[PDB]
Design a binder for this molecule. Structure first.
Ligand SMILES: *[C@@H]1O[C@H](CO)[C@@H](O[C@@H]2O[C@H](CO)[C@@H](O[C@@H]3O[C@H](CO)[C@@H](O)[C@H](O)[C@@H]3O)[C@H](O)[C@H]2NC(C)=O)[C@H](O)[C@H]1NC(C)=O
Ligand SMILES: *[C@@H]1O[C@H](CO)[C@@H](O[C@@H]2O[C@H](CO)[C@@H](O[C@@H]3O[C@H](CO)[C@@H](O)[C@H](O)[C@@H]3O)[C@H](O)[C@H]2NC(C)=O)[C@H](O)[C@H]1NC(C)=O
Ligand SMILES: *[C@@H]1O[C@H](CO)[C@@H](O[C@@H]2O[C@H](CO)[C@@H](O[C@@H]3O[C@H](CO)[C@@H](O)[C@H](O)[C@@H]3O)[C@H](O)[C@H]2NC(C)=O)[C@H](O)[C@H]1NC(C)=O
Ligand SMILES: *[C@@H]1O[C@H](CO)[C@@H](O[C@@H]2O[C@H](CO)[C@@H](O[C@@H]3O[C@H](CO)[C@@H](O)[C@H](O)[C@@H]3O)[C@H](O)[C@H]2NC(C)=O)[C@H](O)[C@H]1NC(C)=O
Ligand SMILES: *[C@@H]1O[C@H](CO)[C@@H](O)[C@H](O)[C@H]1NC(C)=O
Lengths: 144, 400, 49, 79, 218, 72
């Protein structure tokens, strides 16, 4: 078992644990490569930038799981859910839309082609041109 | 654009509901904020619903007076601010039971309300049916008061504005002047009580009371209390002249292989507005996907004794996770999570003493049963006369 | 058969507590090795050493 | 932002809450043109409708004049 | 933008923080409405030193940078602090310069540590409630000057979260130093008979009236 | 993104663009069309041509076309 090496690339120390002192923290100017980041017990985990952007990438998937909690996606400009060729689903017993603004009536306003939502048998949603009555009985090829 | 919201009028026990014209106050992207003028908290008798953009409530006897309400339209700012561009302030005046019939209250509606517009004479006493429930309006939200009103609506066939929900005064749970009365489904009374009253007519007699079977029968059978969500103490016709909360977590549980550990939950672990204590609230232990501990698991937990206990093995050394679920009488669950560290025996192999014994019978049921294991450990502890059974550390069992 | 082994936590990993073990032997055990009447009664009836 | 290659999965146990002034990609979502003369005529298709408490619910469409008014409310009685 | 402060070893240091000049973007109309948090660290470091710490009750309340200077941290110290508005997302980098130096005058061997239960930490951090508490303590410290040494949250020492029903506060540990000897009432408070009474739950033997009452419960 | 509890997509005062080929909503409550109205506050979802989403008052027929003032 290798317990020390120091060559032209790097230095490997085979210590059982790495234990840093000091409450002020530390600075690693290049990176940290850790397979598993775990929070301290009885302690929070926080992934923030003081003044700048945060970018995080994983080409083979991201699982955000709240095994007992919430996903409070608090933004102020855009909660972009942009899938290249996939889909979005909202698996929940109820769906709430608490702040969709009202639309005041136009008994004689200009004719604008508004759209309506039609639901396929598998929950797939698609748009439809609004008409005199309900026009969600025109095509099934989208649902097919 | 300054928008003048008209002043509102509310009556103690009557459901007040006002629609704020949010289209005029707020532009595209502007979101209304409703609070008290100069304060960040609305009055305790009012609740603002952004879905219909409606301020609704039920004032109690302690909410009498004029309540100023500030409505400010916050606007989106590029960096991130939310600037209250247009702030509209209107006042709501609360009147006591000395207020007139809801005909004066129903002064802002295109509907005439002829049913409500019908009244009694100045000398004719008003026949009112009052249902007494085992609930507290102070502990209940104004949303919960509207819930109670519209749940009783399904049995009373009466609109919300014509009802009167008041607290019980001086612990009076029966009316001596009532000519008709009926028991409820509650055999005991916990809260002070609530009186929900609605007019049936003017000085009505027993032979003139309308069909009240749809009120009497469900209250007696308990289905009315099932739909209301609160117990029904009773009913009488007289001629009148939450989710639990958490404060402290369990950081981690320190256990050792071959050692029996037992933890009693602290009395301040969980709180509820209706219960206030952990012991009076149902407590369960669960896994990641809400599955209970098996009978054969090395850790169990008794709800009646509110005590978790266990004894780990070296095949389960390291970390583990568990959830504490706190469910109240209201059917709502608060969740806390905790982690358990199981370590090897610190003394290890260099123990100054090593006790060895061979018994009779197969060790397969004894090893396969954690109940047999803990019984054995506590039995050795009692054999020494000891109290803390953790002082025993079994190290190895071999079939012979 | 059930061949049970265990250790005591009050063992301090120090020079021999021979007097303590001797007291335990004279209290709950016997020179022959059968369970003592107090030990057997504690074991009685689920366990029979 | 959420730039995923494949599907995006949002699963909850009690309910989902989409609080805000929601937009949608009109070009990206398909729209049913009226060129076909009722190819899905008298077909079982549901219309999304708005409850008073923010909840959404789907109502099956029978004729050309099916609104969002319901008698047996799946939203629950508006207590 | 930089500001130079002059802490001394031995006593507490507290800095009330105002978004008016701290933030480069002025907050007009009512400035108390906007919620802004603050993250302070040593320059080129993620966290403040051990002696210094930071707290904030609510984002709609001012934060507080506070701590007691140590003799091992004497000299020049640099604080890089960022004003993170909880709403406006506006970054306001700021530098604070600290010169930890020796105290001037007589030392304060007679230190006293108390637990306040009727107040939160963020209530005492403004200078005027702390001054009122110190004057109330001087109401029993006759004679002798006073100077506070340390402020710590009771939750830092290991207390549990108080119940939000009943008006229960978290409490705070307060160390105040003085060169004057403790009062005879304070001398008899520390007597072991009162400790035995407190172990039984009986009240400690008190001969002097509580000047902290009714504002402060200790 | 699965969670055991409520999920809050809280855009405070901003927009929420959802860019996908397919949107699947298989867990909606099923409503029964009838002339009788259970209560008030019932609305229908309406789409502006630019993607802005709003609501119109529910009736016997569609009312999206009658309420095209908000779309601009
Ligand atoms: C969705 O998010 C928006 C953005 O905050 C919320 O809109 C506004 O939120 C503020 C802050 O919560 C509300 O002000 C508060 O109102 C409550 C009563 O509703 C009052 O007790 C507080 O003192 C404070 O004034 C404001 O009313 C609200 N207005 C509107 C039109 O939405 C909205 O509440 C969020 N909705 C949900 C379901 O989370
Ligand atoms: C491991 O062996 C130790 C023996 O050292 C066991 O601890 C012993 O437990 C007994 C109680 O059953 C203690 O008896 C004491 O008697 C005195 C007499 O005055 C009394 O003052 C004490 O309160 C106590 O009753 C005994 O001192 C104690 N031995 C100690 C502490 O060294 C222990 O139970 C054994 N653990 C096992 C078998 O799991
Ligand atoms: C505690 O009890 C265990 C189980 O009775 C004892 O461990 C056992 O030790 C024997 C002796 O080596 C093992 O037998 C052989 O082990 C090798 C691998 O080491 C295996 O390749 C052979 O096929 C054969 O099984 C036995 O596997 C092992 N049992 C285990 C590890 O579960 C142990 O000696 C006892 N210790 C004391 C202090 O009494
Ligand atoms: C004012 O009160 C604070 C809080 O009690 C004191 O800070 C504490 O100081 C002690 C000793 O200086 C620190 O203990 C040390 O902890 C480290 C681990 O971080 C440990 O490795 C050391 O061996 C030592 O035990 C403690 O962490 C620290 N706590 C905080 C929150 O800063 C401060 O010293 C007091 N100042 C005066 C003048 O009384
Ligand atoms: C029993 O032993 C444990 C050691 O795990 C110790 O913490 C506990 O205090 C002991 N019981 C008594 C009554 O001393």
């Amino acid at each position: 078992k290798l317990l020390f090496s120091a060559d032209d690339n790097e230095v490997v120390v085979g210590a059982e644990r790495l234990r840093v002192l000091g409450a002020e923290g530390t600075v690693f100017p290049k990176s940290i490569e850790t397979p598993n980041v775990r929070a301290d017990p009885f302690k929070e985990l926080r992934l923030e930038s003081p003044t700048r952007a945060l970018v995080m990438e994983a080409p083979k998937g991201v699982e955000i799981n709240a095994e007992a909690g919430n996903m409070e996606a608090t933004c102020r400009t855009e909660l972009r859910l942009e899938s290249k060729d996939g889909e979005i689903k909202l698996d929940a017993a109820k769906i709430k839309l608490p702040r969709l603004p009202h639309g005041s009536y136009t008994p004689t306003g200009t004719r604008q082609k508004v759209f309506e939502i039609c639901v396929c048998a598998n929950g797939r949603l698609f748009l439809s041109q609004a008409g005199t009555g309900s026009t969600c009985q025109i095509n099934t090829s989208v649902c097919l | 654009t300054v928008v003048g919201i008209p002043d509102g009028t509310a009556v103690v026990g009557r459901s007040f509901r006002v629609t704020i014209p949010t289209d005029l106050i707020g532009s595209s992207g502007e979101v209304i904020k409703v609070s008290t003028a100069g304060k960040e908290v609305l009055p305790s008798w009012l609740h603002w619903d952004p879905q219909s953009h409606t301020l609704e409530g039920l004032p109690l006897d302690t909410d009498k007076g004029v309540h100023y309400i500030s409505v400010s339209a916050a606007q989106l700012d590029a960096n991130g601010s939310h600037i209250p561009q247009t702030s509209s302030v209107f006042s709501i005046e609360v009147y006591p039971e000395d207020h007139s019939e809801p005909q004066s209250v129903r002064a802002a509606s295109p509907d005439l309300g002829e049913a409500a517009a019908s009244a009694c004479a100045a000398e004719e006493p008003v026949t009112v049916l009052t249902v007494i429930l085992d609930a507290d309006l102070t502990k209940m939200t104004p949303k919960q008061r509207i819930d109670l009103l519209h749940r009783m609506q399904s049995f009373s066939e009466v609109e919300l504005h014509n009802m009167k929900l008041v607290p019980v005064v001086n612990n009076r749970l029966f009316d001596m002047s009532a000519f008709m009365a009926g028991p409820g489904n509650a055999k005991k009374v916990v809260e002070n009580g609530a009186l929900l009253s609605w007019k049936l007519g003017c000085s009505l007699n027993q032979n003139s009371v309308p069909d009240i079977r749809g009120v009497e029968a469900p209250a007696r059978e308990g289905t009315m209390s099932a739909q209301l969500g609160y117990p029904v103490v009773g009913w009488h016709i007289a001629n009148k002249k939450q989710r639990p909360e958490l404060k402290n977590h369990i950081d981690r549980v320190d256990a050792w292989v071959g050692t029996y550990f037992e933890v009693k939950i602290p009395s301040d672990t969980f709180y509820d507005k209706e219960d206030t204590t952990t012991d009076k609230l149902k407590l369960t232990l669960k896994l990641r996907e809400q599955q209970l501990v098996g009978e054969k698991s090395w850790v169990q937990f008794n709800s009646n004794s509110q005590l978790m206990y266990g004894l780990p093995d070296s095949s389960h050394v390291g970390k583990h996770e568990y959830f504490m679920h706190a469910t109240d009488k209201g059917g709502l669950s608060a969740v806390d999570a905790f982690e358990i560290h199981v370590h090897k025996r610190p003394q290890g192999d260099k123990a100054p003493a090593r006790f060895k014994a061979k018994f009779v019978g197969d060790p397969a049921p004894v090893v396969n049963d954690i109940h047999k294991k803990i019984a054995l450990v506590k039995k050795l502890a009692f054999a020494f006369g000891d109290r803390n059974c953790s002082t025993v550390t079994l190290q190895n069992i071999t079939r012979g | 058969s059930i061949v049970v082994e265990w250790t005591n936590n009050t063992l301090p990993l120090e020079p021999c507590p021979k007097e303590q073990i001797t007291g335990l032997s004279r209290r709950i055990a016997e020179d022959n090795g059968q369970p003592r009447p107090a030990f057997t009664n504690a074991l009685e009836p689920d366990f029979k050493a | 932002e959420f730039h995923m290659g494949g599907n995006m999965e949002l699963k909850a146990e009690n309910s989902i809450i989409l609080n805000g002034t929601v937009m949608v990609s009109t070009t990206r979502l398909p729209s049913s043109s009226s060129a076909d003369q009722l190819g899905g005529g008298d077909w079982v298709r549901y219309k999304l409708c708005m409850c008073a408490d923010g909840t959404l619910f789907k109502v099956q469409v029978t004729g050309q004049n099916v609104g969002c008014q319901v008698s047996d409310n799946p939203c629950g009685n508006t207590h | 933008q930089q500001t130079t402060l002059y802490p001394l070893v031995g006593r507490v240091f507290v800095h009330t923080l105002e978004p008016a000049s701290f933030l480069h973007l002025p907050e007009h109309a009512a400035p108390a409405t906007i919620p802004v948090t603050y993250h302070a660290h040593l320059q080129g470091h993620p966290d403040l030193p051990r002696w210094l710490r930071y707290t904030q009750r609510s984002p709609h309340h001012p934060g507080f940078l506070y701590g007691a200077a140590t003799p091992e941290d004497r000299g020049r110290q640099v604080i890089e602090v960022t004003a993170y508005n909880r709403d406006s997302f506006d970054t306001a980098g700021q530098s604070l310069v600290l010169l930890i130096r020796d105290p001037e005058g007589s030392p304060l061997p007679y230190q006293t540590e108390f637990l306040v239960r009727s107040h939160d930490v963020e209530e005492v951090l403004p200078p005027t409630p702390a001054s009122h508490f110190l004057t109330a303590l001087a109401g029993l410290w006759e004679p002798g000057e006073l100077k506070l040494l340390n402020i710590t949250s009771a939750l830092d020492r290991g207390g549990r979260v108080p119940l939000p029903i009943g008006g229960q506060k978290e409490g705070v540990y307060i160390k105040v130093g003085s060169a004057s000897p403790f009062s005879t009432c304070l001398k008899m408070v520390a007597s072991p008979d009162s400790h035995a009474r407190c172990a039984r739950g009986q009240p400690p033997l008190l001969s002097c009236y509580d000047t902290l009452a009714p504002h402060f419960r200790v | 993104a699965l969670s055991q509890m409520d999920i809050v997509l809280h855009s405070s005062d901003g927009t929420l663009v959802l860019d996908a080929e397919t949107v699947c909503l298989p867990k909606l409550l099923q409503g029964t069309q009838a002339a009788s109205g259970s209560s008030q506050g019932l609305y229908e979802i309406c789409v502006c041509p630019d993607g802005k989403l709003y609501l119109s008052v529910a009736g016997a027929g569609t009312t999206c076309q009658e309420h095209s003032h908000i779309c601009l």
